[PDB]
Design goal:
Its main location: membrane. The chain has 11 helices and 13 strands. It has 371 residues and is α/β, with parallel strands linked by helices. Bound molecules: flavin mononucleotide, the ligand CCOc1cccc(=O)c2c(C)n(Cc3ccc(Cl)cc3)c(C)c12 and orotic acid.
Amino acid sequence: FFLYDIFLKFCLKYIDGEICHDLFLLLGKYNILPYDTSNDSIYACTNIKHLDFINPFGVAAGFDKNGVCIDSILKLGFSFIEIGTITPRGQTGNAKPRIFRDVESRSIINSCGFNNMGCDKVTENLILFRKRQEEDKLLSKHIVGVSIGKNKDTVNIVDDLKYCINKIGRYADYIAINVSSPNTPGLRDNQEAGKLKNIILSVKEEIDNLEKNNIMNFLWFNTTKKKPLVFVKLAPDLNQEQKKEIADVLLETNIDGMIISNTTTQINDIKSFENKKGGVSGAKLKDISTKFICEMYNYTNKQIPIIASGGIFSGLDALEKIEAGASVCQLYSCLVFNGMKSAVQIKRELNHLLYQRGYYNLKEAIGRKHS
Ligand SMILES: Cc1cc2nc3c(=O)[nH]c(=O)nc-3n(C[C@H](O)[C@H](O)[C@H](O)COP(=O)(O)O)c2cc1C
Ligand SMILES: CCOc1cccc(=O)c2c(C)n(Cc3ccc(Cl)cc3)c(C)c12
Ligand SMILES: O=C(O)c1cc(=O)[nH]c(=O)[nH]1
């Protein structure tokens, strides 16, 4: 458990972004990635309704787009993973190279364009994992969510989301509505109050309709054994009117949680990304995101639980997001810049910090900045 850091520093030096991405998914495919069977702190526990996370750290969407590494990635010490984003039909995505990193600022820029094997192939992989999960006592508590979007040419999102829910809904602990991507035009236009309310109610109605089509209680082949929760992933690039307008919709529609936030197209302060096009992740996104959690946690009057992402690399970064209003933390660029150690390390720092600040448990620290 050092060999990986020689590999990582070398990878970050001479190897392309997507080659590392396809290399990491290769190691976990043949299950040759390290384990973390070490028991997690009971004071570091968190939840979103019936969704009970062993620790507050999971993997963001876009890491395991196709769910070919679910068990492998979880075993690194994460409580959950968000597979996808997935679309009804598979897509090659946008032109390569399309993933670039600036080590100096710990940032990433990407124009992937929902590259996936399609909803049907990803479902095939999730059913495989859920089958492994039954036999296994270790992955019995690990949560697996699915991020759903639309094919580039889909003239109406709703139809594309109605298809994915009917296919993969049965095997997800939660569904994440992806209306925040900056690399598939113009998905962000769906963040308008009217459009978003129709999306959220259509999705929730489809989930309800799965049950209303059989006597099987057997029906839920997930971790919770309950209907998936419905979450919405939001872009940080919004004005205050747009944010308040959304808040009022999330309250009326009774959305289960909100993933604040996706990548940002506001950053122009990176030299290595000047020519490049896409959304910016990592450390340069941290300050924006924490400010956006505050705004939304105040706008939804603390009623809608939050999943934070990103710019999370340390235990302080984690506690910052939690004190702002978030219940869980998703990681992405941390896994790119710290590698395999990521979970094990971030989990140590947070327990060390939770004690240092004067907390009995994580829950007690949630939204602490608001007072
Ligand atoms: C290469 C790449 C691909 C991504 N693909 C997706 C995706 O399919 N779905 C999604 O919801 N977010 C996607 N994201 C955004 C992440 O889920 C995450 O919200 C973002 O990277 C911010 O987290 P971080 O600063 O901790 O990295 C992607 C990010 C990167 C770097
Ligand atoms: C599965 C997603 O993979 C990634 C995505 C983006 C950029 C990269 O270049 C990535 C890098 C450097 N890494 C870290 C990594 C990659 C490969 C190895 Cl062998 C060890 C660590 C991941 C997981 C990366
Ligand atoms: O695959 C992509 O294009 C993608 C999706 C998303 O939500 N965010 C991102 O930065 N890239």
